[PDB]
């Protein structure tokens, strides 16, 4: 997240870090005790046996006994298209059930087909790059963004920060976009580098996939 702020510790207890050999590379969202939702491109050709799913984290540079770590048992995809960057969504079934507590909770999703209007105010979040001013975040970051349709398309939720250069960045893919208390997006792709101030950030449109998600987690 470029130009955001530190989240309050455990403000977003559905937020997940996906890791390889102890290193964060993508976010995810806890959507049931034994399922997380992320971006499909995060696991494209990745050996998923190597992926650790880390719940309950805040500061990736500290020891945190709030964390719960899981492996991935099964992947459920929905037609990810890496040429057009469509359907950038995957569900990862965990090898057990999370212990739901103050620091680890299941997210609330929108109704199937729910659209967001221009000007909806949302929060983006993640542990991605802060810039090449700084590096990967240690502490979870959040960012106020606004939903836009100029230079968007109906197959994405797109967002912009008005009046300054700020946005999601590498390592934030897979992280939730929270709009009106619901997970409406999964961070997918930027255009023209991070935080251009010109091209809206693109999120997978979670409301389009609710029936699919429900078919798996129920």
């Amino acid at each position: 997240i470029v130009g955001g702020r530190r989240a309050r510790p455990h403000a977003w207890p559905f937020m997940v870090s996906l890791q390889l050999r102890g290193g964060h590379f993508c976010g995810a969202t806890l959507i049931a005790p034994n399922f997380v939702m992320s971006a499909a491109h995060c696991v494209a050709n990745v050996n998923v046996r190597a992926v650790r799913v880390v719940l309950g984290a805040h500061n990736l540079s500290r020891r945190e006994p709030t964390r719960q770590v899981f492996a991935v048992q099964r992947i459920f995809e929905n037609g990810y298209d890496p040429v057009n960057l469509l359907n950038d969504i995957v569900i990862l079934q965990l090898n057990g059930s999370a212990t739901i507590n103050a620091n680890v909770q299941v997210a609330q999703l929108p109704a199937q087909g729910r659209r967001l209007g221009n000007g909806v105010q949302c929060l983006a979040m993640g542990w991605g790059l802060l810039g090449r001013n700084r590096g990967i975040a240690s502490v979870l970051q959040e960012l106020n963004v606004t939903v836009v349709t100029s230079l968007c398309r109906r197959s994405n939720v797109c967002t912009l920060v008005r009046g300054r250069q700020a946005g999601v960045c590498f390592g934030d893919s897979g992280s939730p976009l929270v709009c009106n208390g619901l997970i409406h997006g999964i961070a997918s792709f930027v255009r023209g580098g991070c935080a251009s101030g010109l091209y809206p950030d693109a999120f997978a449109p979670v409301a389009q996939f609710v029936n699919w998600i429900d078919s798996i987690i129920q």
């Binding site: 971006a39 491109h41 960057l85 590498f170 934030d172 893919s173 792709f189 930027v190 255009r191």
Partner: peptide, 4 residues
Amino acid sequence: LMXX
């Protein structure tokens, strides 16, 4: 366009 750059995934992220």
